[PDB]
Design a protein around this ligand. Structure first.
Ligand SMILES: Cn1cc(-c2ccc3nnc(C(F)(F)c4ccc5nc(NC(=O)C6CC6)cn5n4)n3c2)cn1
Ligand SMILES: [Cl-]
Length: 296
């Protein structure tokens, strides 16, 4: 690549994931939202009742649905969206009061500080550190794909059975293979090979940090296709946001290192961002840039 600028066992194994039919109520008349692979609705998981989000998806596929459930049920971490269970093709997930992280930071009625937004970034880094330690490559880390609960705990989401194209604006079709890919978040090497690694997740995380400090501006306005590769190979990176501290921009530039192996691990990012976070006291209000308002 160019990097210099120019089954009985499966049934028994899935038992701890399955929710019984009469112990879940799906409110099909209360839609939360629509995705490409399924519609998401409000639900009551049942003694004791707990509020949840239920995604309704569209034999080999049944085996894979159960298998994906088991794998997803093993991932338990405060900054990762947990699987509550499955029902058959329904995916039962915790309801996220504040929706996706991008919409949250863009909302003009919210008044985040620098500390708040760096805090969200730190939470995402902790989630990714956990997933990377399980050898799980996300492939689509972005602010739209993380969610926020009632305590403002950020959860890395959009993986496993919750995988979808949640905003179709930011997925571009590769002219040969036909794959719809999030090109504005992709590493230089993934743009060229369509292979993904933990180090390409690190690149994406850098872009996510940029999204946080801009309060959800779209990266690279009017560069929407795989021609982003050419743009990057001119010797370019996303500019430093007005409210991004110098040390955090230095971190973003490390995430976008041309050589994948020279990019920091998520362990390193958690360390570095935690230090930066600790220097702020909640005095710097972050406002939206006039030139990014209303732009796609
Ligand atoms: C732009 N955008 C991105 C997403 C997105 C991203 C990642 C993701 N991973 N899983 C899901 C889900 F769909 F399964 C799901 C799971 C729990 C949940 N809680 C709410 N609560 C709200 O919407 C409240 C504000 C009202 C919605 N979901 N959606 N994701 C949905 C939706 N839109
Ligand atoms: Cl602050």
């Amino acid at each position: 690549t160019d990097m210099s600028p120019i089954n009985p066992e499966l049934v028994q194994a899935v038992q701890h994931v399955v929710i019984g039919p009469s112990s879940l109520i799906v409110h099909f008349n209360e839609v939360i939202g629509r995705g490409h692979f399924g519609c998401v609705y409000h639900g009551t998981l049942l003694g004791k009742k707990i509020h949840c989000a239920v995604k309704s998806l569209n034999i080999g596929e049944v085996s894979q649905f159960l298998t994906e459930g088991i794998i997803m049920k093993d991932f338990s971490h405060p900054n990762v969206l947990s699987l509550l269970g499955i029902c058959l093709p329904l995916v039962v997930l915790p309801y996220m009061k504040h929706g996706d992280l991008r919409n949250f930071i863009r909302n003009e009625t919210h008044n985040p500080t620098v500390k708040d937004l760096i805090g969200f970034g730190l939470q995402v880094a902790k989630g990714m550190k956990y997933l990377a330690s399980k050898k799980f490559v996300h492939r689509d880390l972005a602010a739209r794909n993380c969610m926020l609960d009632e305590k403002f705990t950020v959860k890395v989401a959009d993986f496993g059975l919750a995988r979808d194209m949640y905003d179709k604006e930011y997925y571009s079709v590769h002219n040969k293979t036909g794959a719809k890919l999030p090109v504005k978040w992709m590493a230089l090497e993934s743009l060229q090979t369509q292979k993904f690694t933990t180090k390409s997740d690190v690149w994406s995380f850098g872009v996510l940090l940029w999204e946080l400090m801009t309060r959800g501006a779209p990266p690279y306005p009017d560069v929407n296709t795989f021609d982003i590769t050419v743009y990057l190979l001119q010797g370019r990176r996303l500019l430093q946001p007005e409210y991004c501290p110098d040390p955090l921009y230095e971190v973003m530039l490390k995430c976008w290192h041309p050589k994948a192996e020279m990019r920091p691990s998520f362990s390193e990012l958690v360390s570095r961002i935690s230090a930066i976070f600790s220097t702020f006291i909640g005095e710097h209000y972050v406002h939206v840039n006039a030139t990014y308002v209303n732009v796609k």
